[PDB]
Amino acid sequence: QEVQFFGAITLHSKLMKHWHEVPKIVLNRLCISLGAYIVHMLGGAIEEVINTFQNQRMSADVQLWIMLEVLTAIPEEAQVIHTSVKRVVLRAEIAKRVQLVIHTVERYLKLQMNRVWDAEAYSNMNRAVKCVGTWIKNIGYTIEGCVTITAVLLEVVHKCYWPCIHGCMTADENELAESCLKTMVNIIIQPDCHNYPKTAFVLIKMFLDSLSEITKTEWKRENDNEDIIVHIYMLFVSSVERHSTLLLSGITSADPELSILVHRIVQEILHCTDKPGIYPVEESCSTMALAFWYMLQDEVFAMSDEQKHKCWEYIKPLYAHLTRILVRKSEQPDEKSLAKWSSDDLECFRCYRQDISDTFMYCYDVLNDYILEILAAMLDEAIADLQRHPTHWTKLEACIYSFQSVAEHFGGEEKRQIPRLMRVLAEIPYEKLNVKLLGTALETMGSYCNWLMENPAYIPPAINLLVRGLNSSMSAQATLGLKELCRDCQLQLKPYADPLLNACHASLNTGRMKNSDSVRLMFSIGKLMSLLRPEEIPKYLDIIVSPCFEELQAICQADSKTPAARIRTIFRLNMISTLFSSLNTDVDDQPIVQPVLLVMQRTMPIFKRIAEMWVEEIDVLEAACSAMKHAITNLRSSFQPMLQDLCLFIVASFQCAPTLEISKTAIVMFFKDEGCKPLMQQLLREFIQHSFKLFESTPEQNFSNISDTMETFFGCLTQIIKKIPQVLEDKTLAYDRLVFYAQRGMTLPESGAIRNSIQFLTHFVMQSRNHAHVTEVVLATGEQTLYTAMMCVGYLTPRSQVDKFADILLAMNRKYAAEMAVWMKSLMSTPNFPTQLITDADKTRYTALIIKENKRLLQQHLSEMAMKTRGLT
Template identity: 35%
Template sequence: MEFTAENLEKAVCLFYRSEAAQQAEAHQWLTEAQNSPQAWSFVWELLHPQRTSEVQFFAATTLHNKILKAWDEVPQEHYENLKKRILDAIVNFAMGPKIVLNRLCITLSAYIIHTVPHHWPKAFEELVSSFQPQYLPNVEPERVIWILLEILTVIPEEFESTTLATSQRHRVKSVLQEVSKDILKVVEMCLVPIPNANFDMSNITTYLHSSRCAAAWIQLGGVTIDDCSRVMNLLVDLTCFVYWNRSDPECMSAEEMELIEVTLEALTAVVQHPHTTKYPGYVMKHTTNILDKFNKILNNEKASAELNKDIMTSIYLLIETIGDTHCKLFVSSLRSNEETDRKIANDLFGCILGCTDLPGTYPVDETSSTVTFGFWYTLQEDILSLDTAQCAELLLIIKPYYRQLTCVMLRKSMFPSSEEASNWTLDDKEMFRCYRQDISDTFMYCYNVLNIEMLDILIVQLQDALTKCVINSNNWNLVESVLHAFSSVAECIELENLFLPKLMHILKTIPYDDLHVKVLSSCLECVGSYSEWLADHPNMLCKVVPLVITGLTNPEVSPAATMALKDLTHNCQKFLLPYAEEILIACQNGLQGGNLKLSECVRIMYSVGKVLSIVPVANTMQYLNVILAPSFEEIQSLLSQPESDAVAVRLATRLKILSALFGSLHVVPLDADEENSMPPQNIEQPLLLVVQNTMSLYTIIGSKYHTNTEVIEVLALLLKQTLTTLMDDAKPLVNDILTLVVRIYRETPQPSILVVARTAMILFGKEPEYIATMQHLLAEIITTSLTLIAQLNSTNNLSEKTDLIEGFFLLLAQIFKKVAVLIANGGVDCSALFQCATVCLGMNELAAIKACTSFLVNFITHSRETGQAAVVQNYGEALVMRVLLCLGSAPRASADVLADILLALNKKYCDNFARWLQGLLQQEGFPSPRVNAQQKEHFVKAVLREKANKRKLSETVTEFTLLCRGILTSA
């Protein structure tokens, strides 16, 4: 259908007033119309006043889209006419519809970005002078100012979103930064209150757009806090005026609320700009002004019956931003000889602490305290980075804040009572969970400042909380909060022998049965967190291991119990022999109870493997027979049943549990890691016996369920875990595993099997007795994969097997990198592999492109030592051609990846590469008609110059990619 105004109008109406199927069809056709060269003509017809607002909006959007993405289609001699028509359109739509006017203002902004400074050098001067009320008598003065501010506001936004050549971007940004002071003067004129009458709330729309405009230009970076000083004072005064003079003292209107939020955002944009750090005097002056005036608002809100959470959050965010951005300044002020400077810093820290300490529970009672966490990190980080003497002096000054902060966060992290929690929504609960994680991080910052003094605070708080629980068990939440704090700081603590032994003793004595179950859960998390410390203090294990064992049979705390057990068995393995029998019995009961989730069963089985690795080998098999028997009996039962989705899920579940055991069961003498100790040889590994005795089951699974991806993925994980756990001890299994891998892959190629093959080849590929077997395996995999990829390529369906192609080439890349001996004399058709990878570079999936690139880079890098130099010389030109073509069609992010290939060729085959690159780019219109000969020549020189600097080459390739696609035009 022809792109005529009438057809487009019908299509737009169809898009807004039809069913989903017709809508999609209309959308596709309208998108084609927008991208067509005819769009430059039909937009003006569609902007006719008699058209509907939907059609006019489509036209304005199309015009903006063309300027943004197809600017190179506009001849320079048409620039002036295009500008005139856009300005005329803005004037014609000055009174609305607003949605069309807004889009036209954005369009003019995009035009300005493309034409300054060369084609419209006085754009801003002319813009400000043109949009004055006296020159547009038919338009309301307030609307004229609105239009000017709207155009000015979106210019910085358009600059950030417009793709420009690097040199042009620098020029445009330089111009924008030069005029930013003048733009702020325009904003200042709009914000200045009426003489002797203060601000006029009838101008609230102008104030709103002025504030937005100020924020946009300040963020661009062309002005300093000195330049913004007058505007900042006006914004502070305007915020206070609107707050104290709102139309309804009980409830602020939406327009008033929006204006306050925008003014505060503009102030935040100023104070967080990097340039402000160069003007400490102004920062201190404005901080004083902001604290003096906004603290009155905060205090008024705290005293009111109904908190305005949005205003409080916005004000506190501004104050926190001041503290966070200029923390070093305020830290140095703490040591100042000037009492005024010290007072400002202490007032700021006190205000931020007051925000953290807001009454109520986040997020149901207050929503502001979360903004302060970043400041408490920055404050301690800036102080700890100073030299020892300064650091020690300042730590003494700020410790009171962090002591108070610790106590505040213990309160803020307390769970609500059961009655209160029943009224919480799922969103509330999730936000509180995230909030507690932020508090957990902040506890670590407190520990960095307070060190063991914090542990003293926590121990005292825990003892007090337990005393309160004796009186009333409803005080459990403070006990839980303190245990949460102890868990949070665990990773910060190294050698500590005073407070942590007290903690372990207290953990043993807490009356868990009388308190909420969350207390026991947090206790178990705490035990797991201190597993490394317990490894250095094994005498304390007797106080906590019984708690963990008890938790395994309690479904309400089993997640925490299984995690704690996993941590203990991982970090304290060699000290757990006295508890081995109790742990194994509890694990067995937990597994047989049927109340545990899959993840918990997996963690338990991992722990079982760790514990069985330290008991006498003779006993290990007895325990294994008891613990594993149910799993293997169920697997045998499932394999005797007809195939179904339900059976496959149960089978995959059992294999996951087994793979956890296979990943941890490796018998090592307890003294094997001690100095001067020689581990005895020929240890009979129980895992080896288990896998040997059950290999027939895995073979049946592979044969019966080779088409079920989930089952095979878990089976592959089990086999991989077996290899990586046993390492050299796995040699008796290698042939069986490889046979199974080849059989499954031949039947149904899938990436998880390739991971097993890769693991086996890397571990044993250099062993003389396995080289022949490995080469046979590799040949089978290559033959099967190449056949499949050729079939997919013939039907243009490579994307259907992205994961497989990615896994295949990752396997080959590792082989060339680590076990190239399997390629040499292995009968592998390397030419076919090279050509296949070259073809697959044309895929749209970035992960597959990365894998192919990794293979090709390793192939090229090791080609001479593997005897494959002829392959690169014969097919290298085709590879370079493919890479150049991909630069114009593959995902844009792939340009950085493909640069690796060019770098490898330039390093290893520089003469050939230079000849191929120059020859290909001499072709007219290749790889894109948008790139001229001069740009190609520049690209060739830049590429050939880089033989080591990947970053510079990536920049060159990315820029050439954008040129090929027409996204970037020559400066």
């Protein structure tokens, strides 16, 4: 029973794959196999088959179904058949039969239209339309002949849609309609040797004249049959996108029929975009018009003097009308309706809103600053609606979001609509309405921060709104916006420093605010503490920064080891890091001494203690090292006195990846000047030595277990070598050991280790040419390196990781072409088996190809070679 299908499938696979070997579902598979068999013959067979099956010599409907499955399997088979003849020739041959097929299915449909429709007849007509469809898509057909069958298909669509109305279709009838619309789409987007405006125009006019009744009868109601509508609109949109020259010419041309056609189409697309309901729960049409609007605006921009001006005269009011629709379409469901929504629907709506914002951008491209006038008017309408109905928050949120969508273009001036928006944002009660409105208002206020930078006046209501936002559950948006307000127009916020800090501290005392939001707020608080009088700065250091250290000390006293204590410690460390990431005294009076440094000096032993307590957990260490790193990044120049204690701390941490990372940042930052070279060189020596001591762990277990450490290690080493060439001048380090462990690095299965090891070796090879001390090491370990590379490409590494190896070969080429030539020739010709599978001739040829070369070509060669070595298919 179920195995019979496996038998038939075996027959199908055998027939398709091994023609050279020979010199319900089961029925369909059999028909497909018959189709392939008919496709293999060059010497018409299709005519004979069609005649034989239509003659009903062999159930008549079943026979027809078989015929249709054969005919449908015929062209799709040629696209994947392992035919002996040239593919293009095969397609060109079937192109002779396409007309006969179209005629056969045409006559069949014309005959089936009169009779009454059983379910088998539904399935048959469906299979017929689908046959014509796949035939048109796979093989090109002249539209001239496609006209009549298009008319027939239209009639079929109508016969499917009309009897269903009182309402819903039978789904099977719906299926037939969908198939018809889809094959019509296939017909209209077909490539034409000669693009005739007349024929395309005829097809479009047929589409409109036939489907407009349906679209009209279904647009007003929240119709259940979304499929037919969305596929008719699909047909319109697709057809227009396929021939847009016709559309633009139609806008310019004085031919009444063409202009009327264009107007009617654009109207249908407008209705599609302005379909009532919310996407996608109540309506799914609006998504396929956005692309059209994009393309239209772009094409109008590209085609432009002369008649282009006349084009603008048409598309300007059109896009003005479009913007208003988009604002309504950006409306999110209220608290009630959202209950029906699924998570996927909400995400889909979010992406939808992103698309809407993009479309808003294009609308700005068309309308310039007038889009602000439109958005403003709508915002007013929203306010008036609010006055009429104190519950409504949707329209307001939509208008505000719309304003946020265009925030990038304007900059600071001239505006004259941004201030109005600000006043509206300050007017709104927030407390009375939903909080989502408040959150969006916060995001939008954050989007206009540069505008606030250009205008000093409107800052206090903005900061007030942000505080109100910090009070609410939309604190994430409030803090994103606050950070965005601190990054720019920082200097203008100097008078409002202390009150803002009191507000942030107030928000911090309340237990509600989420942990992440507190971190971001710590960024904002640091940036805001930067612009403070030196006498007032310790007060906030004791109020804001101190409770973090107190809590860290409390965990150290309790000895902790509870998960909550872990989360809390990490949290505090994050707040601290982020505070350090923004607190910079130097601006453009100002305190002489940096506060961060002072705090470091006071808190270093707490870092040591926290390091000792959580040596087992890498998370806490990563957090602390993040604090140090953010510190260094902030005050790069003025960090000098604490760096010695930082070296003591790092050494204390050695006695892990984040330690290597902080070491890296420290070296890259300091090694340049002023006695920092001794400290950085010493620290480097320790950094490498301890790593070696860790490497002394067994390769078999450690290699896979300590792969992350290896990746981080070689990454850091790569970046520091790239940053400072003077590092290689030092002869104290054990370069040979490092090399060996890198060659081991290439072996590891993990992608990161491979990439970082290969990169490190590459840059080491690049920097080795300049210094003799390094060139001795390269000459000493070059052959080993090429051997490991070739083993890795050959069998060792995963096949998807072969690409990574070409770079080191290139480095070897540039820095030492002779050595690569001799070493590759030796290591490839001498061995009997780099691997057994690869042929000597092909191997030698590939080797010749590698030493001569581009990274892409070498990647292709290395890949092909790898396939040959592994003996892959």
